[PDB]
Write an enzyme that holds these catalytic residues in place. Sequence first.
Site, PDB file in Angstrom:
ATOM      1  N   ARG A   1      57.400 108.231 -17.735  1.00 16.30           N
ATOM      2  CA  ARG A   1      58.741 108.473 -18.232  1.00 16.30           C
ATOM      3  C   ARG A   1      59.800 108.052 -17.182  1.00 16.30           C
ATOM      4  NH1 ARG A   1      59.929 110.191 -23.850  1.00 16.30           N
ATOM      5  NH2 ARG A   1      61.852 110.750 -22.653  1.00 16.30           N
TER       6      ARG A   1
ATOM      7  N   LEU B   1      50.467 120.897 -55.439  1.00 15.37           N
ATOM      8  CA  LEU B   1      51.562 120.147 -54.981  1.00 15.37           C
ATOM      9  C   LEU B   1      51.438 118.690 -55.424  1.00 15.37           C
ATOM     10  CD1 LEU B   1      53.344 121.986 -53.844  1.00 15.37           C
ATOM     11  CD2 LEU B   1      51.739 122.150 -51.962  1.00 15.37           C
TER      12      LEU B   1
ATOM     13  N   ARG C   1      72.548 111.043 -24.614  1.00 16.58           N
ATOM     14  CA  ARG C   1      72.544 112.406 -25.189  1.00 16.58           C
ATOM     15  C   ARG C   1      72.197 113.547 -24.166  1.00 16.58           C
ATOM     16  NH1 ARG C   1      68.500 111.330 -29.719  1.00 16.58           N
ATOM     17  NH2 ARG C   1      67.407 111.993 -27.791  1.00 16.58           N
TER      18      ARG C   1
ATOM     19  N   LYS D   1      39.621 118.512 -48.774  1.00 16.22           N
ATOM     20  CA  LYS D   1      39.724 118.505 -47.348  1.00 16.22           C
ATOM     21  C   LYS D   1      40.313 119.784 -46.805  1.00 16.22           C
ATOM     22  CE  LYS D   1      38.716 114.624 -48.239  1.00 16.22           C
ATOM     23  NZ  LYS D   1      38.918 113.281 -48.804  1.00 16.22           N
TER      24      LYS D   1
END
Length: 327
Positions: free
Chosen positions: A141, A54, A175, A64
């Site tokens: 959160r 690639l 959303r 690796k």
Amino acid sequence: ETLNGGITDMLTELANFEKNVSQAIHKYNAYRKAASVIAKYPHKIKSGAEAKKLPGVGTKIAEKIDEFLATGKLRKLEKIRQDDTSSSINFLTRVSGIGPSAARKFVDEGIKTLEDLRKNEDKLNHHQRIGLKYFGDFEKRIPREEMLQMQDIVLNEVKKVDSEYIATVCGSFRRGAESSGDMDVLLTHPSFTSESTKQPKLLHQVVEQLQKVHFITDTLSKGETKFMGVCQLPSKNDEKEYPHRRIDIRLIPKDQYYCGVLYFTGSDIFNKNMRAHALEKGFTINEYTIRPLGVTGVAGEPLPVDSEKDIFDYIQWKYREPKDRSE
DNA sequence: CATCTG
DNA sequence: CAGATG
Ligand SMILES: [Mn+2]
Ligand SMILES: [Mn+2]
Ligand code: NA
Ligand code: NA
């Protein structure tokens, strides 16, 4: 999406560390395209060599993937998940206000922990100081049941200051989302636009109000169009006070609200597809506007929008309620 | 990208 | 001003 998961992941941890601990921006940058590429790759990478194949994939990475493939681990990754210096930098960095850069200095100076931080609150700048102060609250959160209250308040006061304001809480809140991380509010006024030369007060008057009534508690950063702060829902009938919340406020000239508004509402994925299609339909979109695309290669010219409706319309699309803006 | 720091 | 953070 799972056929090359570990690989893409280790690569990431690797990449990550490059930039955060070392300064290996190149290197770091290397891990990225690499994991990005293996990411798309349609098959089951059974070997390094296969991978090398690639682009973005050279020798070392290949090496690796090998060790990783060959064994459920990677030495170097194992050496890093230990190393206290590395661990500190990831940790310190959690503090709002502390980047990696800073993450490094501190540690070199021996500050590796929260206590270390409080002990040396002096080396900390304001933002960092707050950050430290609300470490906890910061990580928590934001349940929408809260969000709704916040929004309620922001909206009432902006309104009070001027009927002509236009506020919008974008984000995931916008959303659908059950809980969000921080509160982002879009802000405009009619009396502020593209050309219109400034009007800072436009932002400040409100910031003031907000703290007037105590919603806003601290200021992270306050410029003429952006404001980074801290807010908090009034703690009721004392027994249960609320965590401190990250909140941002931004002045946007009326003539570019919706692109902005549209934009902030995400999701990233909804954005691109929207952008991709826009392109098709013979257009261009970004944060602030939408432009009729020439054929000469490119071309501009601000198409006029009076809502998210005008935008979609433009690209001749199905008006998406915010919920379905997911992907 | 806009704000802060130093 | 360059350089950091979000
Ligand atoms: Mn925020
Ligand atoms: Mn948000
Ligand atoms: Na941080
Ligand atoms: Na340089």
